[PDB]
Write a protein that binds this ligand. Structure first.
Ligand code: AVR
Ligand code: CL
Ligand code: CL
Ligand code: CL
Ligand code: CL
Ligand code: CL
Ligand code: CL
Ligand code: CL
Ligand code: CL
Ligand code: CL
Ligand code: CL
Ligand code: CL
Lengths: 116, 116, 116
């Protein structure tokens, strides 16, 4: 039942608020319905990035999840996650892409095995 | 109609030209037929990498796009992108991998929603 | 026949042993049956990450391969790779995810073309 969220951004590290990784863990566990134990978060600041040819603040993100991915769900995750990047990192939501991936359990390794 | 291009390389940051992300943005806009506003670019230098067991300059890259991905198009993008990586980052084209992803609009978040 | 392996971890760079990239290359070549010349490896230490909300050592990894991906094969790769991360980076196997991707040859660029 794993899920993992990565955010890559040109915002500097010092502008990522204390607790951001915990907030992402908590809110993604609520949004996906998964226990927080199985949510992993990876935040990558200070990146060399451009969005539409502008180097103003932006983010490129991915959510990989075993299940809980689909049309309506992804719209709800995007409202949640773009809102968090706007409020916490001051990145405009129209300068964020988030790619969503529904992983088959047999294609996710954990603890010397897979979830298949 | 988003697209995005990521380059991970062991070439040092000082060797990535200041104009490289703009050059990639413009050349990918032309190659995909998309307005440059829709293209995001991310360059990640100074990485700990090996390609075929050697740590000479190399790159591992990804192009994710809503449409404009397919057998013939991907052959053409590989020539474009190997040319840019060879000239601007001094990477031999046989030390470049590019993974191509045709993303469904429902699986790309932007601006608080998805493109579906 | 390309394959590539990426490990992202919060373990510090100084904790990644000399020879780790070579060990990954050789062990993956053996595991996948591919010649090492086709294997790329990418290790990303010092990352800002959490797994289950905790920032104890963890890793998020990916193996992309043209073929040699499947249920039993991925279980075997997970035992190998978690074992290497435990022995070499001191990361607990229950704090590792590895995502496996079977890439179509037409979607992997190399040297001015694709593998199709
Ligand atoms: C030069 C040769 C040994 C060679 N190096 N190499 C590195 C990565 C991926 C493929 C290849 C390859 C090939 O034989 C082509 C035809 N697949
Ligand atoms: Cl679930
Ligand atoms: Cl934090
Ligand atoms: Cl999958
Ligand atoms: Cl679209
Ligand atoms: Cl080697
Ligand atoms: Cl070398
Ligand atoms: Cl998709
Ligand atoms: Cl070889
Ligand atoms: Cl199998
Ligand atoms: Cl182990
Ligand atoms: Cl594919």
């Amino acid at each position: 039942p794993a899920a993992m969220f990565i955010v890559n951004t040109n915002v500097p590290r010092a502008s990522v608020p204390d607790g951001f990784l915990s907030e992402l863990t908590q809110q993604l566990a609520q949004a996906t319905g998964k226990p927080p134990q199985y949510i992993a978060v990876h935040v990558v600041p200070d990146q060399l990035m451009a969005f539409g040819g502008s180097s103003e603040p932006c983010a490129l993100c991915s959510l990989h999840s075993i299940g809980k991915i689909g049309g309506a769900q992804n719209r709800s995750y995007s409202k949640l996650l773009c809102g968090l990047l706007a409020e916490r990192l001051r990145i405009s939501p129209d300068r964020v892409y988030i790619n969503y991936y529904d992983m088959n359990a047999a294609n996710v390794g954990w603890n010397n095995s897979t979830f298949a």
